[PDB]
Amino acid sequence: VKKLINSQISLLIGKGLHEFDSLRDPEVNDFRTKMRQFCEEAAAHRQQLGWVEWLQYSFPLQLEPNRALLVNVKFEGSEESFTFQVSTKDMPLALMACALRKKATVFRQQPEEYALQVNGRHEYLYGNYPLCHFQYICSCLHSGLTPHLTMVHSSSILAMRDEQSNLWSLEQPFSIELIEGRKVNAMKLVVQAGLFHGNEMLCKTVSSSEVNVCSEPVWKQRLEFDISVCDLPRMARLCFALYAVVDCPIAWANLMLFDYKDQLKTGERCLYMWPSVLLNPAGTVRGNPNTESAAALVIYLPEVAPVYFPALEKILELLREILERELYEHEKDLVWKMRHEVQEHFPEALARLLLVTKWNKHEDVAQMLYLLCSWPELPVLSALELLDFSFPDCYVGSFAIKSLRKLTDDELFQYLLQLVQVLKYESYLDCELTKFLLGRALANRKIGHFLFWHLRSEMHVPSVALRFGLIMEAYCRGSTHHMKVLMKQGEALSKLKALNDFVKVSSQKTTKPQTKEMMHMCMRQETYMEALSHLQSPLDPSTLLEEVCVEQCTFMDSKMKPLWIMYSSEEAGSAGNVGIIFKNGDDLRQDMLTLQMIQLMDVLWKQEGLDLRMTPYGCLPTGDRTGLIEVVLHSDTIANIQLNKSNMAATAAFNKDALLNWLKSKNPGEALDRAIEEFTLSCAGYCVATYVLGIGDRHSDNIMIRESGQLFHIDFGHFLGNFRVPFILTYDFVHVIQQGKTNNSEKFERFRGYCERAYTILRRHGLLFLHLFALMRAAGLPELSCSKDIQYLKDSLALGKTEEEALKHFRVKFNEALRESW
Numbered sequence: 126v127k128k129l130i131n132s133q134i135s136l137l138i139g140k141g142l143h144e145f146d147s148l149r150d151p152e153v154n155d156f157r158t159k160m161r162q163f164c165e166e167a168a169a170h171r172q173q174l175g176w177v178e179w180l181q182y183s184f185p186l187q188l189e190p191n192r193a194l195l196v197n198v199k200f201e202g203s204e205e206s207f208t209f210q211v212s213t214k215d216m217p218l219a220l221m222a223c224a225l226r227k228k229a230t231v232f233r234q235q236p237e238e239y240a241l242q243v244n245g246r247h248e249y250l251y252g253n254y255p256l257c258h259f260q261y262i263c264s265c266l267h268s269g270l271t272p273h274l275t276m277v278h279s280s281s282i283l284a285m286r287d288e289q290s291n292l293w294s295l296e297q298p299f300s301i302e303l304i305e306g307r308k309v310n311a312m313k314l315v316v317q318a319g320l321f322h323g324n325e326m327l328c329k330t331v332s333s334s335e336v337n338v339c340s341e342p343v344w345k346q347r348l349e350f351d352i353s354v355c356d357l358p359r360m361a362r363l364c365f366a367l368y369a370v371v372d373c374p375i376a377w378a379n380l381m382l383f384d385y386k387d388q389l390k391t392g393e394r395c396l397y398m399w400p401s402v403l404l405n406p407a408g409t410v411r412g413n414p415n416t417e418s419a420a421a422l423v424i425y426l427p428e429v430a431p432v433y434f435p436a437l438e439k440i441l442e443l444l445r446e447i448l449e450r451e452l453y454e455h456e457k458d459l460v461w462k463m464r465h466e467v468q469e470h471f472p473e474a475l476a477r478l479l480l481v482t483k484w485n486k487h488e489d490v491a492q493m494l495y496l497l498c499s500w501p502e503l504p505v506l507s508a509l510e511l512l513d514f515s516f517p518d519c520y521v522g523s524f525a526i527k528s529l530r531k532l533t534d535d536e537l538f539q540y541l542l543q544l545v546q547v548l549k550y551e552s553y554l555d556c557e558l559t560k561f562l563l564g565r566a567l568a569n570r571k572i573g574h575f576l577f578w579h580l581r582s583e584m585h586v587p588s589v590a591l592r593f594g595l596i597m598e599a600y601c602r603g604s605t606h607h608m609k610v611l612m613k614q615g616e617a618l619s620k621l622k623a624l625n626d627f628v629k630v631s632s633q634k635t636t637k638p639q640t641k642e643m644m645h646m647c648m649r650q651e652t653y654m655e656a657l658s659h660l661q662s663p664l665d666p667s668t669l670l671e672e673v674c675v676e677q678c679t680f681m682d683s684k685m686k687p688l689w690i691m692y693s694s695e696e697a698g699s700a701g702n703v704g705i706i707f708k709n710g711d712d713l714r715q716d717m718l719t720l721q722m723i724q725l726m727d728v729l730w731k732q733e734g735l736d737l738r739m740t741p742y743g744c745l746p747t748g749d750r751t752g753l754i755e756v757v758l759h760s761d762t763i764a765n766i767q768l769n770k771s772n773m774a775a776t777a778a779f780n781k782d783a784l785l786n787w788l789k790s791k792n793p794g795e796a797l798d799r800a801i802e803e804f805t806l807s808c809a810g811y812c813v814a815t816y817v818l819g820i821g822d823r824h825s826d827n828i829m830i831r832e833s834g835q836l837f838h839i840d841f842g843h844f845l846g847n848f849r850v851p852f853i854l855t856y857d858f859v860h861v862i863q864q865g866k867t868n869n870s871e872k873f874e875r876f877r878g879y880c881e882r883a884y885t886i887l888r889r890h891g892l893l894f895l896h897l898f899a900l901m902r903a904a905g906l907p908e909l910s911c912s913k914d915i916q917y918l919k920d921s922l923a924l925g926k927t928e929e930e931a932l933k934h935f936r937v938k939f940n941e942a943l944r945e946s947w
């Protein structure tokens with residue numbers, strides 16, 4: 126069996142386990158064994174959790190950031206069900222108490238023994254919460270639907286649990302011998318080398334003597350660095366660049382001066398280089414794996430004697446306020462001088478003190494660490510700052526995770542994307558972040574689900590394949606059962622790719638009707654019906670994709686020919702009718718970031734009691750230019766509606782009336798007002814979110830509207846201005862906001878209020894967005910590459926002003942936008 130599991134892992138993670146062995150690398154070997162231990166311990170802990178704790182692990186509650194309602198309840202075993210009236214304020218237990226009482230009378234005759242499942246879903250209602258605190262009981266009230274629930278007994282939950290069981294001495298200046306290379310080019314070659322600790326240089330960047338573009342070059346020259354070897358910090362990083370000149374970059378390579386055992390490196394090394402876009406401190410510190418093709422640089426770290434970075438005990442032995450909220454030399458000096466006072470009175474300024482310490486003087490790093498070692502824990506917001514690449518020291522990183530353990534699962538979920546990207550900054554495979562992420566993921570299956578996909582979706586990238594591969598293996602060691610559940614997803618995704626390639630070929634030779642019919646036959650093959658049915662959705666594991674409806678599936682006719690896949694479930698009813706889009710050919714990372722940030726805005730808004738009726742649909746990259754998007758049903762494009770077709774309810778005398786007629790048609794009589802209100806609110810949310818994010822090229826093809834009135838956006842691939850994008854008011858939306866009237870400043874100005882509140886709320890969390898984008902720079906998105914991009918956000922949230930100023934600023938733009946509107 127142990128053989129079976131390995132091969133399943135290999136298939137799942139998209140890398141063969143044998144490839145790990147062949148590298149014959151101790152670090153990899155240790156990472157693997159230690160982490161397998163850690164993960165297997167976790168699994169053990171799980172298989173003895175109480176039933177409530179199990180539910181908590183497997184189906185984490187989905188909560189919102191008096192009045193009565195109808196709900197239908199039934200028991201696991203039988204068909205008969207009852208429809209109760211209850212209050213939105215009632216606890217789940219109160220509801221369970223009705224159900225049981227009701228069963229006792231029909232079935233001729235203890236609430237605490239149960240949980241309530243959402244019909245056809247991996248979702249449960251339990252805990253001390255009023256019903257309307259539950260996202261599903263909420264959803265129900267807005268959409269109008271009668272919540273449908275099943276009483277699940279503790280012994281059934283336990284059956285699920287069961288089935289799923291598995292030194293100071295050296296003062297001479299540092300130096301390296303540059304021996305030779307083996308590259309391809311046109312001119313003379315030079316090597317530039319600099320020592321880094323994060324973004325900062327630890328001294329000037331000494332270069333090579335130029336040699337002709339010949340070879341296979343040979344240098345054999347001592348490069349000697351402007352710093353003492355007892356002054357190299359633990360996380361010292363040596364960076365090379367090779368280029369040509371009479372300016373043409375060619376390749377770069379980085380390495381840690383200390384191995385993962387704190388021992389300083391000697392003697393010789395071969396560096397397999399990464400091709401170039403001169404110096405790249407943030408670039409991975411591991412060599413290019415394509416050792417066949419890569420230009421390669423041999424160098425020699427002189428054996429200065431075994432020398433280790435000294436133990437912590439050894440380390441442990443050895444106008445303020447006004448500026449304190451970039452700083453001049455003396456200012457920095459004042460800070461450093463006052464470090465105990467910083468510690469004692471402004472612990473929240475840790476980062477600023479870290480950026481002023483002299484990482485190229487061991488004494489000062491010792492002093493700093495001593496302070497860091499008694500430093501009170503920080504708020505989550507400050508911890509997120511400390512994970513930035515500007516803080517490469519592992520004791521800093523350690524403290525940072527320490528301050529992050531207090532993250533809730535919901536918060537952790539909210540920042541998971543960024544945390545995974547941060548793994549790219551990591552210098553060694555065995556690290557605090559990795560242990561932290563793995564531990565939270567083994568303790569929460571939703572976390573586990575999305576961690577997996579964030580990693581899996583990056584396997585095609587040589588620079589992260591090893592790291593992420595190893596993380597996924599460890600995870601799998603920790604959850605045998607979930608591994609199988611994930612394979613079932615991978616199998617579905619394998620078949621969709623096949624089906625999608627077919628469709629792309631077919632549609633170049635034939636009509637859409639024909640291709641669709643072919644897709645359907647393909648899908649109807651046993652192997653596909655089986656692969657595509659009965660899975661957890663990669664977009665949301667709590668969504669069950671049961672039987673695929675072939676007749677409903679189709680494809681979209683835009684370039685990559687995205688696949689449109691519908692599903693249904695008898696057990697879930699209406700809520701079982703769900704759809705996924707498969708797209709192969711585009712980079713989806715962008716859209717996912719944009720969507721996650723809008724989701725974040727919606728959360729912050731709802732936390733101050735503003736519900737802008739947002740539509741935070743799923744988007745999940747899964748593979749190389751491959752991923753899924755969640756289908757929003759009952760929606761159509763503005764453009765499509767604006768086609769103003771004959772023979773439809775929405776037929777208008779004037780095109781400006783089209784969108785409003787459509788809304789009328791879907792929302793007759795008294796319903797109309799609420800729709801117009803949903804439109805207004807969501808419009809405000811999207812106008813603010815796009816303005817803040819610098820998302821341009823919005824137009825009627827990529828804006829959609831739901832039959833409730835809710836407006837939302839699809840296909841963002843441009844943001845942070847990457848064409849200063851102006852605030853956008855669209856006449857046709859304005860016309861819908863003003864209830865079809867040429868003049869209606871009551872409605873229009875309410876609408877201005879909404880935008881203004883939304884914009885002001887976001888400013889109060891501007892630092893959160895800043896910190897989050899900062900970490901994203903680790904992802905390599907072409908529209909998130911440098912400071913000018915973060916600067917875009919700075920400018921959009923006018924974070925450098927008082928609230929009064931920024932609002933005045935905003936107002937001018939908003940006004941300017943209206944003027945632009947016809």
Ligand SMILES: CC(C)n1nc(C#Cc2cccnc2)c2c(N)ncnc21
Pocket residue numbers: 706708716742744754755756757758760761762839840841
């Ligand atoms: C009807 C069609 C325009 N469309 N496109 C959709 C889309 C999309 C998308 C999202 C990210 C990247 N590329 C395409 C869509 C959706 N999500 N729900 C319902 N309808 C949708």
